[PDB]
Design a protein around this nucleic acid. Structure first.
Lengths: 79, 91, 107, 99, 79, 103, 107, 93
DNA sequence: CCCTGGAGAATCCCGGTGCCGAGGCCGCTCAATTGGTCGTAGACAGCTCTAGCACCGCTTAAACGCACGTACGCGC
């Protein structure tokens, strides 16, 4: 699995900024948003990996991601 | 197995406050996670409050202090009044 | 063995006092848990639940909806200032954000 | 005839109004899932993910990116601009303490 | 005790901005900084008041202030 | 109630400001005076509960925490000022920083 | 009985294993505390303390001072990127901040 | 009088172990003690949470290892895990 | 209008005091250490079965790219 950071396509970032009320979206901010998303995922998924490793499991459940987001002050409801 | 859930109590509270509205599975799951997270926050605040003054017990004053520490504004006072009313009706 | 009456009915409440007390006991939170602590906790949870469901019903009536959808719950949470400050570190799934547009963005 | 030729900004406002009231997920499910898989491959080669775990990751990432875009737009309006910039994102991350 | 919000003097806010590396300091920053400090104190001192009222004490200790700063993610060391 | 009523130095702005920045950034002592901050603390506390006292060390901890928080807020405000192609901070920058911080 | 050898010397450690175990037992964290958990906690605490004190000593030597002052500790925390991420939400009294100047500030 | 628990002499011994030519003031000592208390509380709470989420009643060395991987980031976390593993292997030897 | 030489003032290195907080020492006592003893949570073996991994049709809304110009980013 390589070059999946391009999977977050340009209209996806367009829609994400439109949800946030952005008027104009630059051409250079897509790479920056991809990097920010990569950093956030490399934190949260790594925390969930540690949770799954401690949980004696090889499959990352939604609950482990839930407290992985909770421990960083970003608690998510509904899972 | 049996899994603990808060669906029916939230449902009857909803029927008490608004009997003309329903709820969905996703909305129930959001409400369950919200009430559970508030439970852990208030219970942990009460546990820390007991641990600060070498208190071996958690009383209603622990929950009231946790509510005033967590809930801002008039929400904390309303929750404190509701808890006081429930405590007086309990005895 | 007399009649089994729940503490929620004696306190005029719908949330379970006994389940809250059991989760406090097995939650390793303290060595002892008082009698009034689960009653106070259940009363606070009941008040917060009633307020959130009332605001969600108001938002659903504003959207011509008679079923509570997580969009309505997100609108109810973010519309109230106290709920927005309390749940500032809270992510809500299938809720979006408020439909607010800045003044300089309008043409 | 001539085309209608919408001025720049009107379709932006229409999309803002449409997405600010719709709760659908903007990021496609499979590319985000595969990005999650290659990110987790650096920590554990023999790992699996539940569908609801990917759902929770997608929702949390979407909400975090939407909040970051809101802060970026507010900083752009603060900086006499309407176009979001990478330096605005860097400022928003530095104020929030994530940079 | 009245008009105690003016105790935080204008050169005190100027020196606080100098510690933060602020090049130029506007004349309207002082009232806004006083209001922000008043809001922060009205949160922290109220939390310490609740902490002191919980412990059946009449004067507030530095440990309760430390707890009130710690519960909001602004933990303070040395007290 | 009963009353009827040769050439001077002339330092340009900015250089002495940077001098003070370098002097206070490497410094350690407290910038805010003790008793005005203590009196403000008592005035704020008297609105919540009367007949309340603060010890010297509690006032010290509150003063240092408030100074650090305001220094971080001023750092974010200056960063937004340079971000907005400016060297002078505005209260709207402070409001923007508070909004981004979530408070 | 036998010689009362401390658990810190048995594990090659300086932080008290027994004090950590007692604080874990009375700290309302778990019903039971394992054997290796206080040793692991004391090892992590000693490594963090040693790294922070070494960085503070280096900062004091840059300032050429013998005694460690809170300025040295604040410089040690803020200079290290790992310590900056670990203690981002930490306020250090009597320490100030980093003496850094923006590029556009200098004339 | 009353004996209050503190890590003043332990942090002092660590300082003399790693830097045998410097001293430490009481304010810096109290700052280090507060840092030790905060890190101890954070790791203990994380270990208690990890025990609770797996429906397990005890806290083992793996709980502390997961807590220091979750809290400490990066190479600091890897070095902390290595030091903890070395201390566990020395304690059980 | 720009480059270079001379001097006013905040800042930095250094000699001398000493002093008051830091380092080392005396007990000793209360928390740390040793041994046994069980209830019991936890490590391990076998079943399974329900949800996840991989590939396939397909079709269709989602996405890359090119042409044009006017709101806006940037220089003055």
């Amino acid at each position: 699995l390589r070059d999946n950071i391009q999977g977050i396509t340009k209209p996806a970032i367009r829609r994400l900024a439109r949800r946030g009320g952005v008027k104009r979206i630059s051409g250079l901010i897509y790479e920056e948003t991809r990097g920010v998303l990569k950093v956030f995922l490399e934190n949260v998924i790594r925390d969930a990996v540690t949770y799954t490793e401690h949980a004696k499991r090889k499959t990352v459940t939604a609950m482990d991601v839930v407290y992985a987001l909770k421990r960083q002050g970003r608690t998510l409801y509904g899972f | 197995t049996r899994k603990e859930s808060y669906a029916i109590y939230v449902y009857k509270v909803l029927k008490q406050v608004h009997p003309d509205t329903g709820i969905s599975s996703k909305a129930m799951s959001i409400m369950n996670s919200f009430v559970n997270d508030v439970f852990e926050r208030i219970a942990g605040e009460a546990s820390r409050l007991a641990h600060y003054n070498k208190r071996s017990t958690i009383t209603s004053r622990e929950i009231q202090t946790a509510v005033r520490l967590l809930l801002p504004g008039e929400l904390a006072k309303h929750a404190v009044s509701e808890g006081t009313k429930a405590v007086t009706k309990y005895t | 063995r007399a009649k089994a009456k729940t503490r929620s009915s004696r306190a005029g409440l719908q949330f379970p006092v006994g389940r809250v007390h059991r989760l406090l006991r097995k939650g390793n939170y303290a060595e002892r848990v008082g009698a009034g602590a689960p009653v106070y906790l259940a009363a606070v949870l009941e008040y917060l639940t009633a307020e959130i469901l009332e605001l969600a019903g108001n938002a659903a009536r504003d959207n011509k909806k008679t079923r509570i959808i997580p969009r309505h719950l997100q609108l109810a949470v973010r519309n109230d200032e106290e709920l927005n400050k309390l749940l500032g570190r809270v992510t809500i799934a299938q809720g979006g954000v408020l439909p607010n547009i800045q003044s300089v963005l309008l043409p | 005839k001539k085309p209608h030729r919408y001025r720049p900004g009107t379709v932006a406002l229409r999309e803002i109004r449409r997405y600010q009231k719709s709760t659908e997920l903007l990021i496609r499910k499979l590319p985000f899932q595969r990005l999650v898989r290659e990110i987790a491959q650096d920590f554990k080669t023999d790992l699996r993910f539940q569908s609801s775990a990917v759902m929770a990751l997608q929702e949390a990432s979407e909400a975090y990116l939407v909040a970051l875009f809101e802060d970026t737009n507010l900083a752009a309006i603060h900086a006499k601009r309407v176009t979001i910039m990478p330096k605005d994102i860097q400022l928003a991350r530095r104020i929030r303490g994530e940079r």
